[PDB]
Design a protein around this ligand. Structure first.
Ligand SMILES: OC[C@H]1O[C@H](O)[C@H](O)[C@@H](O)[C@@H]1O
Ligand SMILES: OC[C@H]1O[C@H](O)[C@H](O)[C@@H](O)[C@@H]1O
Ligand SMILES: OC[C@H]1O[C@H](O)[C@H](O)[C@@H](O)[C@@H]1O
Ligand SMILES: OC[C@H]1O[C@H](O)[C@H](O)[C@@H](O)[C@@H]1O
Ligand SMILES: [Mg+2]
Ligand SMILES: [Mg+2]
Ligand SMILES: [Mg+2]
Ligand SMILES: [Mg+2]
Ligand SMILES: [Mg+2]
Ligand SMILES: [Mg+2]
Ligand SMILES: [Mg+2]
Ligand SMILES: [Mg+2]
Ligand SMILES: [Mg+2]
Ligand SMILES: [Mg+2]
Ligand SMILES: [Mg+2]
Ligand SMILES: [Mg+2]
Lengths: 386, 386, 386, 386
């Protein structure tokens, strides 16, 4: 009954189940978790692996010796459990030095520091076997219009990513980058605010093939955007390297609810898309167990993430396998959407009097699309009412 | 006192001052305007030119002879007034045949019809001297998840734009395309919903150099996005071919208020950016005089569009010329943002102990950015309080 | 399998299934429906009754004789089918004369006309047996700040409703009023924009007992508000006289999707609340079959409204009857929320050293609320995964 | 040139200029401020007074002796500066014990503790001379639907406020309560989310005359609502006891920008309303100097709050005094909006054939409202372009 196994490729950030519950208006409600205990508890729940920021694993300002002891304890817990580390990232947002950004801070010496902090963790990530390195520029942005010339900032952002690309290729590392967009919070506006802006930016990098996106359900929904649509565009471009799964109730602060909470029907269409397109990357949960919860609630919340994915996967598969749904898809001409508009070419199109001069516009206009019957079949399948 | 001349390059769509005031809940409050009268009235107000959809100028379903008479009357009014036609577009949204889209309609015969309708108006646009051809895919999208496979739809969208690009190059036309994004309305979600998604899509076209964006103030703000930031990214990519100016009060239906209404400070930063970057295209107003207004209100509203642009232009120029502002920009290190992070290169950066090993993180963290003083200087300039 | 009967009290506006599909950017896609056919088709689907604006039933500007013939045909179809008319309303928004409002139009003669148009339809509503009379002030509002002094407008709004209350009581009519809030569209901002503002306004009327609210799912969600929470406040105040059910995907134009579409989990909690509180009024659907649909799609969409209500009703009832859920509610102390804080009174509270001086704040802080386990049980029940 | 004096009644919370810059993703960027220094610095800037939560002034868990020393130091600084304390409030949100609320926490013993903590600070507030006591229920709410029965929670909320009302009247205190609404953050949804919901709730209290609202600019704008409209409804009801001034850029996390930032035109219409209605309460700024700023930026930001109010006050006064504006107000029939619709009464209205039978609907429909000319005059005045 919806039990995960490591083959389902579910992963969690250390910072997720480890969130102590400090928010802008309140103190922590839970004690800190040792990374080692987190790995053990997640392995017992059926997770495939964990992810980390450098500063989750190695307390900021550790000596090189303390650093090695922290990595050794962590590696021992990975070996003890079979857990993998498919993704790593850099914390370029917590420390006060990053208050105006890392890669696009106005101060040049902060920008250089941000690059050196990132490069050091890329080495560690490769050693632990990470395949994707995520960059979330949470502090890259502004609260006021004059504080940031955005063209210069984009120059600085491109420079930083180009330099990281030169570093990995000069080291022969097999790692790819994924940019994680967010429209706002903690800055008033964040640069590269959506999947689309990030995809557009990547095409201006020196080595675009090394970069993709790491979209997050809740972040696109903070702009009121359709998350499955954005994921479809990222797949279409070949750029879906990683994904952050969670829940969000509309346009407000980033809630990071467990996956399946928030917009349930969007979660259904997302799972349908990922499974139909054969996405094979990690199913990563970037979520926060609400600060109302004790530690038993934390693990119930993490378990719920995986459970909801598996239930939705079953319902989406039943939806697509149902002969009556396959018939309704043809009734709505989804098969025709997949056929070329003009494989015959431009000149044939221009000579085709059935496409314009003799096109029966009123007859085509009268045909219903039958979309509502199709959508009610999808509802019936989601609710198990079929 | 803020009087426009044709050198200011202000343009208006025929559909703007010609909007009869029909909304989803009410009938028209104004009679229709003859395109010829609109050209004359706008010329008297100081406008530079007009834009049109095919169906604004030529009633849908006109014979070829009636078509020629409509164009002739229009051309005579352009010659009488000196008005230019810098942009044209296709109406692929009003007629019922486009209820599920034009370029991405599920029905293949509608998609072919949409292409032939567009190609016919490209010819007319070139004859009238338009330099930019805008495409707003207002019906390309969905209300439900199963109605549209977005990867197939993007295939169909790319196919359509590739075919238009083949047509203009095979005809030797000097015209470029601009895609106008909108997140929603009249479809529940529209494909290519923001500037960013449109920029990303263009990079997958066969001839990307022929395509740019036509962002609209209100459309990006319907996603809660920062419009000057999005414009900066479009300029950075070299893709700002055209712009739609209006006003919008936040995340709600597309209001199309006169420019300067809605988010006043965003309008100030937009004008500052366009004028500082040397944007030389038309300043096009895509706005709707509210249906409360009679015809005297329509022309007062159109006049207000141009007036507000000119006032904001004056205030932005005073802001940037003020020595105390130039000093505050240096205090906030905007000059350092414009300098390369690591022109010395990757190896020099890696060897630079001042960038990491000996970087004084606490000292850099203590420096204030002085952004609030800078933003209050900008406020004082906007309000004429200096 | 989820079949409605008239005992379920499902009702539909004539304007819902009768929506021709005209939106701000397109012409009608469906022919008009005769009110008589609509009554017959809805009766066959299992509906309990219909609602109407005066202008849905009687074409605007009909002579008194044509008026009587229209009512007679309608009454004959009600008798033929057994359909009831539980609610009626006035169209104070379509005709151009209402472009600046009805009850709060700046022009006094329009305000008087709006009152006479309303009073005439109250008579008709009582004759057809309506118990609730709805007022949706769709044009009461403004696009700009100086156009409407809101204190004077609220004076005019109170005056209008006070006069309607005097009319019904002087006629001895057994009818109550329900105000339907909406935050925006078609005006830039609408007066009484949410359930809360409407409830507050009612308490200033001369006869508050005659007035309640008619909240609509999508309207509260256009402000990002929690619709079940708002309904709970209306029930708490004793003011839920009527309800408009539909679906909405977040903060954007009013979509009026079929009920169950949009925010599915909000629909579940709404049905749970209405059924648990014993709401006995009509379950009224104010929805628009998308303009992609032909007439077969219209009736499939209407059927889906009722189906989704019945499925959600079953799942909510199973949720509340599940012993493991009843246990989890006690684990989360929902039983304690229902017990008075200080039935012992103020002085006992002040003397109770266990409430402050000797309260163990750290122990109380450590208790988890177990909300995530509870919410996953609700998810499992909604998805039929239990 | 726009210099404040204590007669302008500008006040600041200790928590505003004292915000250390900790947000959900970062550590503090500024050291803590001694309340005494804050009073001195604000007095030098021209402020009239300060406000406080109990826990801003007295560190949580202080002994009764340390408590007295903290109050004594504070009182000495008030006497040294002439600063007043017009408002006080309780912190029922920071400590982990309040993670599920104070007055509406599911645990009864937490609810009793919350009441005793509040009552203790009411005594202190009266001793310092506060006239208004604010309650912001930031933790009263839920992230999930089953966690909170809202009808029971409203029962508990009413019980708490009724008990506070009994306490102040039994002590003979001259203090009034103001409820501060917020739609969300830090809870997923907060009870009483807008001005309207709060006004409606007050009317169910035992002693409604003791309670009013403390609206905050940014909070109503987090629901996309028109803040001047909401303030007008609160004034109309006689319930505007206090106000929180700041800035907010649309629907997103609560930014608490300095007043004048965010929606500039809304700030203009707000100042016009407050000054025209003769609001005489404090002009309180609940704002956060951005964490990019050092202490010089903090005081520049606080100074900007007062400056922007004074500039807007000047522009609104010029707008209302301009004869051409007074003429345009009559052209738009604002004078008619202020006149009764039917002072002649119901029977006269029903007998008046000019109101319906002989009303010229087409003539009334043709009259333009001239709202756009009026709004451009307001724009010209705001920008100093007249
Ligand atoms: O960059 C990795 C992560 O960093 C932070 O935790 C962000 O909140 C999250 O969105 C991001 O994915
Ligand atoms: O495509 C040209 C225009 O068409 C329609 O009028 C749209 O509303 C507008 O946004 C667009 O710019
Ligand atoms: O007033 C009755 C109805 O009128 C209009 O159709 C509105 O769109 C709807 O919201 C309202 O309920
Ligand atoms: O209750 C007083 C204050 O408490 C908190 O600081 C809130 O953020 C603010 O909105 C409120 O006004
Ligand atoms: Mg997030
Ligand atoms: Mg996130
Ligand atoms: Mg993330
Ligand atoms: Mg628009
Ligand atoms: Mg537009
Ligand atoms: Mg446009
Ligand atoms: Mg609606
Ligand atoms: Mg509605
Ligand atoms: Mg309705
Ligand atoms: Mg706030
Ligand atoms: Mg606040
Ligand atoms: Mg506040």
């Amino acid at each position: 009954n919806y039990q995960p196994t490591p083959e389902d490729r579910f992963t969690f950030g250390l910072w997720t189940v480890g969130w102590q519950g400090r928010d802008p208006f309140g103190d922590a409600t839970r004690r800190a978790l040792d990374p080692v205990e987190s790995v053990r508890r997640l392995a017992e729940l059926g997770a495939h692996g964990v992810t980390f920021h450098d500063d989750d694993l190695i307390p900021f300002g550790s000596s090189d010796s303390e650093r090695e002891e922290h990595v050794k304890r962590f590696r021992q817990a990975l070996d003890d459990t079979g857990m993998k580390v498919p993704m790593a990232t850099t914390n370029l947002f917590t420390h006060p030095v990053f208050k105006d950004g890392g890669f696009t801070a106005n101060d040049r010496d902060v920008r250089r520091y941000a690059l050196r902090k990132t490069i050091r963790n890329i080495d560690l990530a490769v050693e632990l076997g990470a395949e994707t390195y995520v960059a979330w520029g949470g502090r890259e942005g502004a609260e006021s219009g004059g504080a940031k010339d955005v063209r210069d900032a984009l120059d600085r952002m491109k420079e930083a990513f180009d330099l990281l690309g030169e570093y990995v290729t000069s080291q022969g590392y097999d790692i790819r980058f994924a940019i994680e967009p967010k429209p706002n919070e903690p800055r008033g506006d964040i640069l590269l605010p959506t999947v689309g802006h990030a995809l557009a930016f990547i095409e201006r990098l020196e080595r675009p093939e090394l970069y993709g996106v790491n979209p997050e359900v809740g972040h696109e929904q903070m702009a009121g955007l359709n998350f499955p649509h954005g994921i479809a565009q990222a797949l279409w471009a070949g750029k879906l390297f990683h994904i952050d799964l969670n829940g969000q109730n509309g346009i407000k602060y980033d809630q990071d609810l467990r996956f399946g909470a928030g917009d349930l029907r969007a979660a259904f269409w997302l799972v349908d898309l990922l499974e139909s397109a054969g996405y094979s990357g990690p199913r990563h949960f970037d979520f926060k167990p609400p600060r109302t919860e004790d530690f038993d609630g934390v693990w119930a919340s993490a378990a719920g993430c995986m459970r909801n994915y598996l239930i939705l996967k079953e319902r989406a598969a039943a939806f697509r396998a149902d002969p009556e749904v396959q018939e309704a898809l043809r009734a709505s001409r989804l098969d025709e959407l997949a056929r070329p508009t003009a494989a015959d070419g431009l000149q044939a199109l221009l000579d085709d009097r059935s496409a314009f001069e003799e096109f029966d516009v009123d007859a085509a206009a009268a045909r219903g699309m039958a979309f509502e019957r199709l959508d009610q079949l999808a509802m019936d399948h989601l609710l198990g009412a079929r």
